[PDB]
Amino acid sequence: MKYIQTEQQIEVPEGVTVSIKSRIVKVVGPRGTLTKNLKHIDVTFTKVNNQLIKVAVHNGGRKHVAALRTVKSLVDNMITGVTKGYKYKMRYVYAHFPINVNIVEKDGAKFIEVRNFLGDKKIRNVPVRDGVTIEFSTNVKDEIVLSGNSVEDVSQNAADLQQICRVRNKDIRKFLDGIYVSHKGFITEDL
Amino acid sequence: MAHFKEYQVIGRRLPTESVPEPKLFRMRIFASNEVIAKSRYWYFLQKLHKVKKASGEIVSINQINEAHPTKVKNFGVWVRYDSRSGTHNMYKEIRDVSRVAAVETLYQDMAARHRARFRSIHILKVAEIEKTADVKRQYVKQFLTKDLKFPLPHRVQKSTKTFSYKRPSTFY
Amino acid sequence: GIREKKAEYFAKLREYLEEYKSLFVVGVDNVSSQQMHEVRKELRGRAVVLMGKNTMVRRAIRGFLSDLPDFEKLLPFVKGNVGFVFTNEPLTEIKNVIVSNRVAAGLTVVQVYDNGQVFPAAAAPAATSAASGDAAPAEEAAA
Amino acid sequence: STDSIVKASNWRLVEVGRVVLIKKGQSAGKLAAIVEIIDQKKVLIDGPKAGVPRQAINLGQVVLTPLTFALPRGARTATVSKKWAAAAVCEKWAASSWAKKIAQRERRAALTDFERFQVMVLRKQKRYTVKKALAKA
Amino acid sequence: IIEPSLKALASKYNCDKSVCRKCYARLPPRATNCRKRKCGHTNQLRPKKKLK
RNA sequence: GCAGUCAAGCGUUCAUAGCGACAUUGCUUUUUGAUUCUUCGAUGUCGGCUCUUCCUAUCAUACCGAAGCAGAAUUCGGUAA
RNA sequence: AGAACUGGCGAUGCGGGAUGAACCGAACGUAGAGUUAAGGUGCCGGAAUACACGCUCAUCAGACACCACAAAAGGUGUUAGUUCAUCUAGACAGCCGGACGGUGGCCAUGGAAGUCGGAAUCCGCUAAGGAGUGUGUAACAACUCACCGGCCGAAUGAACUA
Numbered sequence: 015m016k017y018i019q020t021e022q023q024i025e026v027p028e029g030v031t032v033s034i035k036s037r038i039v040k041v042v043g044p045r046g047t048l049t050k051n052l053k054h055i056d057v058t059f060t061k062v063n064n065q066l067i068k069v070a071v072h073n074g075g076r077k078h079v080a081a082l083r084t085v086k087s088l089v090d091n092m093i094t095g096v097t098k099g100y101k102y103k104m105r106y107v108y109a110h111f112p113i114n115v116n117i118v119e120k121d122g123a124k125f126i127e128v129r130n131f132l133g134d135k136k137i138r139n140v141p142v143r144d145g146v147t148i149e150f151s152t153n154v155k156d157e158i159v160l161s162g163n164s165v166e167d168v169s170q171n172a173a174d175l176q177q178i179c180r181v182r183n184k185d186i187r188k189f190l191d192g193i194y195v196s197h198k199g200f201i202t203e204d205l
Numbered sequence: 206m207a208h209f210k211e212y213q214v215i216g217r218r219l220p221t222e223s224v225p226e227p228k229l230f231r232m233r234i235f236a237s238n239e240v241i242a243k244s245r246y247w248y249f250l251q252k253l254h255k256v257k258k259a260s261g262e263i264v265s266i267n268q269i270n271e272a273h274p275t276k277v278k279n280f281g282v283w284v285r286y287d288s289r290s291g292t293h294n295m296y297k298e299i300r301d302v303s304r305v306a307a308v309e310t311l312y313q314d315m316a317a318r319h320r321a322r323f324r325s326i327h328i329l330k331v332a333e334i335e336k337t338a339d340v341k342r343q344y345v346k347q348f349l350t351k352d353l354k355f356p357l358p359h360r361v362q363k364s365t366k367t368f369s370y371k372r373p374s375t376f377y
Numbered sequence: 378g379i380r381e382k383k384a385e386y387f388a389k390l391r392e393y394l395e396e397y398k399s400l401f402v403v404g405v406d407n408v409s410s411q412q413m414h415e416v417r418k419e420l421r422g423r424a425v426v427l428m429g430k431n432t433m434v435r436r437a438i439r440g441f442l443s444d445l446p447d448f449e450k451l452l453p454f455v456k457g458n459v460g461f462v463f464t465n466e467p468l469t470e471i472k473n474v475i476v477s478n479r480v481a482a483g484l485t486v487v488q489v490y491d492n493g494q495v496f497p498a499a500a501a502p503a504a505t506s507a508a509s510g511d512a513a514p515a516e517e518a519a520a
Numbered sequence: 521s522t523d524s525i526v527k528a529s530n531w532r533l534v535e536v537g538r539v540v541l542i543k544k545g546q547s548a549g550k551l552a553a554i555v556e557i558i559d560q561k562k563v564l565i566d567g568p569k570a571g572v573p574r575q576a577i578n579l580g581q582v583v584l585t586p587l588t589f590a591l592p593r594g595a596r597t598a599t600v601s602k603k604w605a606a607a608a609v610c611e612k613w614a615a616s617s618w619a620k621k622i623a624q625r626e627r628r629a630a631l632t633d634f635e636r637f638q639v640m641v642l643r644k645q646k647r648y649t650v651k652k653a654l655a656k657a
Numbered sequence: 658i659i660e661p662s663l664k665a666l667a668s669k670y671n672c673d674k675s676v677c678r679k680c681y682a683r684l685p686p687r688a689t690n691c692r693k694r695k696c697g698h699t700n701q702l703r704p705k706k707k708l709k
Numbered sequence: 710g711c712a713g714u715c716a717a718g719c720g721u722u723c724a725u726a727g728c729g730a731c732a733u734u735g736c737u738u739u740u741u742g743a744u745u746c747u748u749c750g751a752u753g754u755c756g757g758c759u760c761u762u763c764c765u766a767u768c769a770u771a772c773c774g775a776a777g778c779a780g781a782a783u784u785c786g787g788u789a790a
Numbered sequence: 791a792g793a794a795c796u797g798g799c800g801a802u803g804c805g806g807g808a809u810g811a812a813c814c815g816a817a818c819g820u821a822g823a824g825u826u827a828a829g830g831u832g833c834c835g836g837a838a839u840a841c842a843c844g845c846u847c848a849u850c851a852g853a854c855a856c857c858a859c860a861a862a863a864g865g866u867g868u869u870a871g872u873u874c875a876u877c878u879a880g881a882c883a884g885c886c887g888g889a890c891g892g893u894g895g896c897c898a899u900g901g902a903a904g905u906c907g908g909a910a911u912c913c914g915c916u917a918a919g920g921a922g923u924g925u926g927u928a929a930c931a932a933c934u935c936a937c938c939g940g941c942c943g944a945a946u947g948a949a950c951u952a
């Protein structure tokens with residue numbers, strides 16, 4: 015119906031700095047810094063204090079107002095990644111052929127290498143993304159673990175791994191093989 | 206159907222020797238001019254009572270000028286209108302400074318939102334909502350808040366001349 | 378049904394405000410369903426306890442500001458999670474059955490009402506020492 | 521930096537007490553004040569001092585100025601006039617570039633042929649003493 | 658092989674879905690409408706069929 | 710000739726995996742009817758051969774979604790000429 | 791294909807509908823000046839990239855009478871509206887506290903105490919608390935939920951119309 019004014023609030027926690035100019039956002043915390051380009055949405059940021067920043071959309075209708083909320087979360091998720099940080103856990107799932115999974119690299123690329131998927135003589139490679147680090151659980155069989163400051167980059171690297179193992183020409187209800195996201199959260203305040 | 210004026214229109218059946226002094230009936234009528242106002246009067250009289258202008262007359266036509274023309278008021282409007290598939294009743298609110306103004310944007314709004322032309326619409330009642338919080342539609346309560354203020358982002362001055370030796374700004 | 382039941386609460390509420398002339402306003406923040414069940418037994422003598430929604434009580438109390446009207450200056454106390462204990466027993470006895478007894482690791486008295494008065498329950502906790510010395514430091518003030 | 525630096529657009533707000541410059545019409549050129557907000561594209565305005573009649577007007581035909589002043593919402597014409605005087609609006613307005621340039625360009629427009637001539641002979645005289653300066657440091 | 662809980666992980670992804678009965682699109686199990694432009698965002702879904 | 714809507718029914722159980730009666734909305738102009746507008750101072754009348762190009766309502770081949778897909782095989786559908 | 795009344799085309803240029811017998815406007819000596827019709831006024835193209843309030847985003851938008859088509863049926867796209875219901879005796883949602891006594895209810899058995907499972911759904915004390923919504927145990931525990939309340943402060947649910 016067009017809304018005269020509607021806004022959102024971003025809690026800037028103790029230890030992080032968020033600065034905004036031309037709808038370009040930089041968030042700096044103890045884990046580091048993240049940048050994001052929000053020129054593709056018309057929102058005007060306003061700062062109340064170093065702990066709280068308000069986002070608003072003057073005179074906007076439904077679908078415009080809808081973007082407002084997601085800007086909050088977007089920026090929110092940046093703040094937490096740079097403090098609490100993000101970690102995605104995955105699990106190897108196979109009924110016969112054990113999925114052998116290693117890290118390899120060319121020209122300092124860093125890839126996630128996957129061998130023997132369903133017996134496959136083929137060799138899958140997921141490029142590791144800048145900022146995400148691949149570990150392997152030591153107390154949990156067939157896990158693998160991806161951690162970083164950016165959910166965006168971490169969740170996507172997680173999906174890329176999981177998607178390279180999609181099983182073709184079989185009943186995928188019966189052939190459940192793959193690498194799937196087993197848990198997603200942080201690297202701080204418990205696991 | 207233009208720049209609207211409100212009319213007091215009053216008529217009666219023509220006197221008969223059986224019924225001298227037949228009763229007077231009045232309507233409030235929004236129309237562009239008296240010649241439409243009178244005609245709208247008969248339009249309704251035909252439908253309500255059972256009368257034809259051939260047997261009745263027009264006692265008086267008087268323009269109802271808005272009482273407080275520069276005082277912002279909230280208007281409740283009631284409407285009956287026909288659609289491509291049915292005929293429906295509606296309640297709407299309009300914020301303005303005069304009944305005549307209220308009607309104008311009502312007639313525009315019916316057309317934009319429901320494609321309803323003038324012919325397809327009866328106005329049932331138009332009533333200045335006295336006590337705020339008897340206002341019932343969000344797009345008007347929105348303007349009822351205290352110390353209310355808003356900007357007008359992205360301002361586009363119209364250029365008087367075709368070429369401009371400077372890149373424009375929308376900065377208001 | 379929903380109006381029926383609420384109206385009943387208005388009934389039994391009024392019923393205590395007329396009979397019982399003294400009122401205890403307590404605050405059972407946290408507190409088990411079990412504790413309250415035992416304060417009933419430990420007060421089955423005189424006092425009766427009556428819990429309710431705050432929005433109901435203010436409306437109800439204001440609704441009865443005609444007859445028995447000095448329950449107006451009771452309303453600033455019916456905030457948070459409070460309850461009612463009505464009685465016709467001596468003051469300091471009931472109060473200490475409420476507070477101290479059935480305590481856990483109880484419920485606290487936040488204000489008391491007695492014939493149009495508002496006690497902090499602190500002034501109720503008298504030691505007869507501030508009342509004796511005042512009758513002592515005044516006699517020497519007259520001698 | 522170690523502060524959160526967030527530069528928010530400082531818009532002229534449409535609000536009671538906002539003074540505005542009438543772009544279009546028969547009161548075009550004049551200042552008025554906003555009394556009451558009708559809807560998102562309309563307002564009630566009043567400009568007693570400047571001779572502009574209290575009316576409803578589209579925000580299209582008016583340009584918001586940076587001037588605001590204390591005004592109860594709905595103020596009748598009479599009291600508007602008192603608060604406008606009290607606040608010295610016209611005073612502040614005339615002190616702006618915005619006001620000065622309008623006045624300058626009107627003065628230019630009023631010039632006689634002869635006066636333009638003089639402006640030429642004077643401006644010329646000035647140029648002389650300027651290029652000399654320009655060739656020293 | 659494959660512990661019951663991992664067999665659940667693979668099912669969250671492969672088996673616990675609904676299907677648009679107009680265009681077969683594989684949808685979230687609790688979806689009310691389909692997401693596809695082609696079937697007119699229909700609300701004629703059905704659960705993805707479970708194995709034996 | 711081709712494609713829909715409804716869902717009684719089929720499908721061991723289960724309307725809609727695959728189908729789908731009774732009814733009902735359409736699309737097409739390679740059928741065949743209907744018409745008689747053009748050509749009767751004449752537009753060479755069938756099929757094949759040969760060669761190009763187009764249509765897609767797709768048979769194959771690419772990548773998918775679905776199944777009453779265990780595998781193999783098949784079937785239903787999408788992007789696709 | 792065949793009648794009815796009228797108006798046309800045929801026999802008729804002209805302005806408009808790009809185009810076009812029949813539609814709209816208007817019927818015609820040779821010319822000047824003004825004004826118009828129907829239709830138009832971003833550019834082709836003479837004429838406001840005029841003013842005003844809305845609506846619309848189409849990986850198959852739409853764009854003007856005659857006229858160069860579209861249907862039954864669908865959409866949690868977005869707009870406005872209707873109806874029934876809830877709510878200032880305080881809801882909806884969000885966060886928070888409580889979530890009890892007969893009682894481990896009776897069968898049934900290795901053991902089954904609310905939660906493998908049979909039959910019952912009772913009472914107490916309540917502002918409220920099921921002879922139990924799940925999770926969890928060998929069985930109890932522990933946790934959850936329906937139910938109630940604390941805070942907040944005016945809207946919320948469902949079905950529809952176009």
Ligand SMILES: [Zn+2]
Pocket residue numbers: 677678679680681682691692693696699
């Ligand atoms: Zn679909």
